[PDB]
Amino acid sequence: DPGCSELIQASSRITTCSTEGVNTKCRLSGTALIRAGSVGAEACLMLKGVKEDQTKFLKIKTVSSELSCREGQSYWTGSFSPKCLSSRRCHLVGECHVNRCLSWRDNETSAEFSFVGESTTMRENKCFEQCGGWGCGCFNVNPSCLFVHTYLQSVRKEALRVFNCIDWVHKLTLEITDFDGSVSTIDLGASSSRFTNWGSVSLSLDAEGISGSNSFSFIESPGKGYAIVDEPFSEIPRQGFLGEIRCNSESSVLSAHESCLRAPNLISYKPMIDQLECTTNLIDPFVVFERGSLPQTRNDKTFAASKGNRGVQAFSKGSVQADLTLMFDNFEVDFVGAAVSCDAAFLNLTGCYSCNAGARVCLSITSTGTGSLSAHNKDGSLHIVLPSENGTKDQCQILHFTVPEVEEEFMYSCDGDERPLLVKGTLIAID
Amino acid sequence: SFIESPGKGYAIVDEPFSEIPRQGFLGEIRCNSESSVLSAHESCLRAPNLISYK
Amino acid sequence: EDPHLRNRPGKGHNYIDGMTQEDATCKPVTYAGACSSFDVLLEKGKFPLFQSYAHHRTLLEAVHDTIIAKADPPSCDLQSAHGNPCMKEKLVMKTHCPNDYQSAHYLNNDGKMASVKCPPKYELTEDCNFCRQMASLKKGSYPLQDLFCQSSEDDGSKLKTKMKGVCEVGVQALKKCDGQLSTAHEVVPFAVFKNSKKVYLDKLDLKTEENLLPDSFVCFEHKGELKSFDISQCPKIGGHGSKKCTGDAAFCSAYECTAQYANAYCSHANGSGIVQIQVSGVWKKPLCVGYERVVVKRELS
Numbered sequence: 001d002p003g004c005s006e007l008i009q010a011s012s013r014i015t016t017c018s019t020e021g022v023n024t025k026c027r028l029s030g031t032a033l034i035r036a037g038s039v040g041a042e043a044c045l046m047l048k049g050v051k052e053d054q055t056k057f058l059k060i061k062t063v064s065s066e067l068s069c070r071e072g073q074s075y076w077t078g079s080f081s082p083k084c085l086s087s088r089r090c091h092l093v094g095e096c097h098v099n100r101c102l103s104w105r106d107n108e109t110s111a112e113f114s115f116v117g118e119s120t121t122m123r124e125n126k127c128f129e130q131c132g133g134w135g136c137g138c139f140n141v142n143p144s145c146l147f148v149h150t151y152l153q154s155v156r157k158e159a160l161r162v163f164n165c166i167d168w169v170h171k172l173t174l175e176i177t178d179f180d181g182s183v184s185t186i187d188l189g190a191s192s193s194r195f196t197n198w199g200s201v202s203l204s205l206d207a208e209g210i211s212g213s214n215s216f217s218f219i220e221s222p223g224k225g226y227a228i229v230d231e232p233f234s235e236i237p238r239q240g241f242l243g244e245i246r247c248n249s250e251s252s253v254l255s256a257h258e259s260c261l262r263a264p265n266l267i268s269y270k271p272m273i274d275q276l277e278c279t280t281n282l283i284d285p286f287v288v289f290e291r292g293s294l295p296q297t298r299n300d301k302t303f304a305a306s307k308g309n310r311g312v313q314a315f316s317k318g319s320v321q322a323d324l325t326l327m328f329d330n331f332e333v334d335f336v337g338a339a340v341s342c343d344a345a346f347l348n349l350t351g352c353y354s355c356n357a358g359a360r361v362c363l364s365i366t367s368t369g370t371g372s373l374s375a376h377n378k379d380g381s382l383h384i385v386l387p388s389e390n391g392t393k394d395q396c397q398i399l400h401f402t403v404p405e406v407e408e409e410f411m412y413s414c415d416g417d418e419r420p421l422l423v424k425g426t427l428i429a430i431d
Numbered sequence: 432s433f434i435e436s437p438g439k440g441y442a443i444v445d446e447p448f449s450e451i452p453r454q455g456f457l458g459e460i461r462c463n464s465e466s467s468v469l470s471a472h473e474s475c476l477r478a479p480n481l482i483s484y485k
Numbered sequence: 486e487d488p489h490l491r492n493r494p495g496k497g498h499n500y501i502d503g504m505t506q507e508d509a510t511c512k513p514v515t516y517a518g519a520c521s522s523f524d525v526l527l528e529k530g531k532f533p534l535f536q537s538y539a540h541h542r543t544l545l546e547a548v549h550d551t552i553i554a555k556a557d558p559p560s561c562d563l564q565s566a567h568g569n570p571c572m573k574e575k576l577v578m579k580t581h582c583p584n585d586y587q588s589a590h591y592l593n594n595d596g597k598m599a600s601v602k603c604p605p606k607y608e609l610t611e612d613c614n615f616c617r618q619m620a621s622l623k624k625g626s627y628p629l630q631d632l633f634c635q636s637s638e639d640d641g642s643k644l645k646t647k648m649k650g651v652c653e654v655g656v657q658a659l660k661k662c663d664g665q666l667s668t669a670h671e672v673v674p675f676a677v678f679k680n681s682k683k684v685y686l687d688k689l690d691l692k693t694e695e696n697l698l699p700d701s702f703v704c705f706e707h708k709g710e711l712k713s714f715d716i717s718q719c720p721k722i723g724g725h726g727s728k729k730c731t732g733d734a735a736f737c738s739a740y741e742c743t744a745q746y747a748n749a750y751c752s753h754a755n756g757s758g759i760v761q762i763q764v765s766g767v768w769k770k771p772l773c774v775g776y777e778r779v780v781v782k783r784e785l786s
Binding site: 029195196197329330 | 647649660765766
Binding site for chain 2: 071072073
């Protein structure tokens with residue numbers, strides 16, 4: 001089980017306390033900086049009340065080191081299929097002429113399709129002259145007309161959103177645990193802040209950064225995995241290129257709305273008197289989605305997807321070198337003086353000394369009620385606070401040491417009276 | 432370029448000045464007075480597509 | 486489709502003790518009768534929130550429905566001796582009273598319901614403070630807030646006003662500021678919870694969800710746009726009742742439609758549902774959320 005990493009003491013000048021109803025009500029109003037832990041560490045803050053037997057931690061568990069994306073220009077795309085209609089009218093019948101057919105406008109609606117309905121899709125109107133006479137399907141030798149109404153319609157039930165990344169924002173998913181017991185999972189990136197119940201935490205100094213993301217393109221799939229394309233972001237929907245038909249939402253692609261942006265003159269027409277063949281050349285994004293799907297090995301990093309927050313993440317080799325700033329906006333913290341007993345027992349010890357992670361210690365907490373344990377060493381540098389329940393539970397955490405042969409005696413107490421306890425174990429040397 | 436603070440010390444920046452507010456530059460959100468900054472007046476200038484939405 | 490702005494769900498009562506002389510037209514509130522405490526609520530360009538939330542209860546309807554507590558006394562006199570308790574919490578309330586109206590109510594910082602009035606023969610002023618002499622005196626209560634209320638019983642005593650840069654708003658002393666105070670009026674929303682005080686919030690997030698509640702449909706009466714019709718007389722699904730009602734799929738999917746045997750063509754109301762606010766990043770069930778102008782004492786030194 002993970003535990004603390006950098007145990008610091010809160011400043012008493014910005015932390016006041018008071019006695020209200022045989023208890024100890026303490027307030028928190030200040031700003032304190034703490035070193036951010038590595039993958040699997042915590043940013044614990046020791047809080048001391050008016051007495052000496054009141055010790056409460058503020059566990060800020062760190063999941064892992066991630067690099068989130070920063071979206072800016074995005075659009076929706078997908079597959080479509082033309083649905084053209086055939087309507088041949090003879091010459092000199094209604095609205096059928098040569099100049100009216102050779103110079104027909106797309107925005108205008110002919111008389112042979114006005115009764116169909118002005119739908120909210122990407123539709124158009126075309127006209128092509130054909131042969132005349134009794135040998136074609138009319139009675140006059142003048143060229144007849146052929147009004148074609150083509151509208152797009154998506155045949156697939158899925159959609160894809162194409163976006164890019166401009167800066168790999170180093171995201172640190174933190175698991176903030178309040179003093180009373182409330183556990184909240186948030187994240188911090190670059191220098192943003194997240195408001196909580198006790199206050200607001202924000203990322204301080206950063207160093208881990210990856211540049212050169214404008215020459216790539218990512219595709220998001222609702223429900224499936226992500227993808228990556230080895231090309232810059234497309235800005236012009238030209239014919240014969242991936243990204244000629246763009247929209248704005250998922251329903252605009254699944255239902256083929258009229259608000260989508262497409263390339264002009266993209267529908268092919270092959271009129272043969274009565275036979276009409278309307279085909280397109282839309283690039284299927286599923287091919288690139290299945291050929292270049294995450295994870296993909298690029299350069300010397302590892303670009304992958306994500307689990308919690310929907311976004312593009314990047315995994316790089318290295319530890320966590322950052323700081324965390326915790327600001328309090330007047331948060332009242334109460335505490336009830338416990339009076340239960342406990343008998344702790346040593347279990348094992350395995351970890352590292354002078355490292356970023358620390359040494360994982362385990363104690364056999366055995367009590368008869370629900371309380372809290374408060375342990376400390378000799379010089380007052382180490383502190384152990386683990387939840388105590390009714391029964392025999394094995395609570396484990398992480399401690400820091402600067403010696404491979406740890407022989408420090410601890411003094412654990414669950415009410416105020418300490419008891420002797422010695423720990424031991426062999427550690428390894430690692431950075 | 433130099434930085435002036437009301438009633439405080441000064442500073443120096445080893446970076447050329449830009450007449451257009453752009454991202455990643457010291458001056459992406461500029462105004463014309465201190466009241467236009469402390470209260471964020473609508474007459475200020477800013478770069479388009481700067482606030483991220485999720 | 487478009488819901489009406491006068492169909493008041495629930496009881497539909499808009500009156501208070503001491504100024505209940507308008508009970509002949511404000512009990513209930515329908516198309517017949519001009520209720521003085523409801524005409525200004527539908528003014529275009531004055532209360533946009535009340536017009537956006539049509540099918541929703543108000544402060545007075547919440548008082549009559551045992552939702553918002555009452556003050557003591559609920560109707561304080563302005564020209565009475567021995568001071569006036571209903572002035573210390575109202576002087577820092579930047580309001581505006583037009584004419585004719587004699588009484589005016591407001592939502593105090595104690596979560597109750599207070600109101601002031603002028604004794605005959607006097608009326609309100611421009612600052613809604615003292616009384617002056619004038620035509621007719623509308624025996625009612627002029628609303629001074631743009632709030633909407635609903636039925637909820639969600640406890641929220643562990644949430645208080647935690648604004649940034651605010652020392653003391655209204656009459657509730659927040660944080661202890663040893664410096665000076667910036668006495669100035671501004672705009673800020675608020676939200677009152679159950680068994681708590683008037684909690685002020687800088688930002689808010691409204692959420693509307695559609696359900697199958699009876700207060701989410703409008704009906705157009707006819708013989709068997711047009712006028713309104715009482716929806717409480719429509720029968721339920723799988724049963725009968727008083728009269729008969731019919732509508733589209735949204736109305737037939739919840740109640741029983743008799744088609745030609747009905748007397749009112751009902752439809753779906755586009756402006757109702759349960760409204761929830763997001764405070765401290767946690768979605769809760771508020772009671773009465775408003776948006777007035779108060780005097781916020783910010784920092785300075």
